[PDB]
Amino acid sequence: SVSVALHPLVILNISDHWIRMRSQEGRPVQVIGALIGKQEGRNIEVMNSFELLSHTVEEKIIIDKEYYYTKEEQFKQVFKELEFLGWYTTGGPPDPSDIHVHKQVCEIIESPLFLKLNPMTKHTDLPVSVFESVIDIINGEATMLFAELTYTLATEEAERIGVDHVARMTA
C-alpha cells in the first residue's frame, strides 16, 4: 500500500516511446522503460521516465541490465536527488509476460511500481494504470499477481511550462 502521484511528463514520455518505436518498426510494438522520482514514506511521486533496452531470449523478454546501470548512472549524474521507482510497458491488462519482467525489475529495486499504458483506447480518457505486485497463495503455491493502485496527477509549480501551457498552443 502506497500513494502514487504521476507527473504528466511520464505519460507523455511513455506514449512518445511507443509512437517512435511504431514509426521505426512500421508496426505497433511493446515498449519498456524505467520510472524515476522520489518516495517519502508511503508517498511515491513519479517524475520522469526513460527508455530501456530489452532482448528476446528463449521467447522471453529480458531487460538489459548493463544498459540499465549505465543509463541510471548518467541520469543520476544530473538528477542527484531522484531514484529508480519501477518500470513501465504498453499493452492491455497485466499478463504473465509482465510478471516475468517484473521479477527481473525486483532484482534492481525492492517493491518496484509497474505502470501500463494502453495505446489502443478510444474511449478512456487516461489509459494509464499503476500496479504493485503481491504474492498470493490459493492451491498450494506462491503466485505473483498485480494489485491495481489508485493514482493522482501530481501538482506542479506555477513556473513550470507544463501540459496546460503547451496545449493552449497546439489547437
Numbering used by the authors: 38 to 208
Q: How is this structure described in the published paper?
A:
In contrast, CSN5, also known as Jun-activatory binding protein 1 (Jab1) carries the catalytically competent MPN+/JAMM (Jab1-MPN-Mov34) motif. Here we report that CSN6 N-terminal domain containing its MPN domain can form a stable heterodimer with CSN5 catalytic domain in vitro.
The CSN6ΔC structure encompasses the typical MPN domain fold composed of a central β-sheet made of seven strands decorated by three α-helices and a small anti-parallel β-sheet in the Ins-1 region. The MPN core is extended by a C-terminal appendix (residues 192 to 208) that includes a small helical portion (α4 201 to 207). Although not unambiguous, these NMR restraints were useful in combination with sequence conservation pattern and crystal packing information to delineate a CSN6ΔC surface potentially impacted by the addition of CSN5ΔC. The CSN6ΔC surface engaged in the binding to CSN5ΔC most likely corresponds to the region comprised between the α1/α2 helices, as delineated in Figure 2B with dotted grey line.
